[PDB]
């Protein structure tokens, strides 16, 4: 159950192999080693005789660093006919992907192969209900190889995806569905990855880990269909890094969301207040102009009828964030999911977590009782 | 104008110190229209991302529009003006106040030096 902390995202291959050993000798009964597409590729799960090998979502992948597509694909691929037993490997995979049918026809042919897909009728999986919710997502899966009850998702088809490719591997094991009670309630934990909202009566608050702009812009766009009201989203850009990358994500938020925050995510070591403007300087205005608004209260709003706000410290203004939404609404936080570490210049420090947004959503209750008004970023404060 | 049709006349080439605002339309031909710190409707939607990267941005520095406390001309076009660039007014405001300007000179002149004129029916015309 515990995990050890590594630097990089795939640790050493013969380190790995120890520490399973190290496990299996006393204190676990099975060591699986699951490593992405970068691992694989790269010779950490390459190295391991795996008994199931399924893909989640088969897509381009490393394509810039492996310099070929398919490349982490086939590496799995080769892998997993490297050992193979038959009717032992699952082929699990959504049938919509066309690298995942390559990999699937690679390999021994004796290994078991399913699809996970919901529209495919060969998958004969399909959700065949509507539940979904920030809260809990249940579906109805009606398959003759799947469970019958379905895990409760944050996102409204990423989730519903990996719990029908969950539900393939659960159901191999032990063909009843009451086994896979245990593994719904641990996907509806809410971890760190694609966070669901939280379990007290307030706003609804997803943590979200999004970076790259394809990312981000399919998790806003999947906000969006989940989102009945508003889509409040908050979210910074890093230091030295792609100096490209701010201006798309910042017109990609500006485009779906009505109201989103920019600030400083990662400063490292890099100007404030710079790359600020940077992501200002995408729907076309100047930090100048914005401040030269502030001295007045009107704060015009975009021309498509959006609304745009900015702050330099980000715990104030995720706390504001979180402060201002509606009921219906859904705060989202795509600045960062599972990290703990701000590096604001040459100091890190680690005051990121939702800790702050439960803190923030018990105190807006004595915010809203002692009259300050949260609608929008310039506050009313009486007197 | 003058200005203008003196330089090829004597073959000077313009100066490289076309300055454009960051609104991308400031030019010796913007300036004077009507509409000020305005963007003009040029069909398509304005390609910002475009914009940013023929400007600058991904190699190098770019002119990053952040307000500072040293005492540095922000704007590019008050580098060499000693105090700031002049106040930034239309054609027609320029117009508008010659004209007055020159009415009023002739009020103050007719007003001391001019209580009399050739017509005789200054009763019903001064007032």
Redesign the interface.
Known sequence: DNKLESPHTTPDAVLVQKLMAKMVHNGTEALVMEASSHGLALGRCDKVDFDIAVFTNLTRDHLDFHGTEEEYRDAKAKLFARMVDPARHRKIVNIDDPNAAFFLAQGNPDVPIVTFAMENKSADVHPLKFQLSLFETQVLVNTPQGILEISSGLLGRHNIYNILAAVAVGIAVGAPLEDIVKGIEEVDAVPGRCELIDEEQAFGVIVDYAHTPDALSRLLDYVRELGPRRVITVFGCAGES???KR??MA?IATDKSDVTILTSDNPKTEDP??IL??ML????W???DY?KHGENDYYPPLPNGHRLFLHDIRRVAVRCAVAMGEEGDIVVVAGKGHETYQIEGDKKEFFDDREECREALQYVDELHQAGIDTSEFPWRLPE | LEALEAMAKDNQPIPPRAMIL?RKYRTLVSSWIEPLQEEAELGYE?D??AR??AEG???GD?K????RRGKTP?DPDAEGFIYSNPRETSFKQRCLEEWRLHHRKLLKTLHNEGPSILGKISESDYI
């Not at chain 1, 300087?281 to 076309?284: D, H, I, L, S």
């Not at chain 2, 990053?64 to 307000?67: Q, T």
């Open positions: 792609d100096r490209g201006p798309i017109k207040l710079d403007d940077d300087a995408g729907v076309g100047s930090m100048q401040l | 960051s304005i910002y991302i940013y990267v941005g991904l190699t770019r990053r529009w952040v307000p922000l």
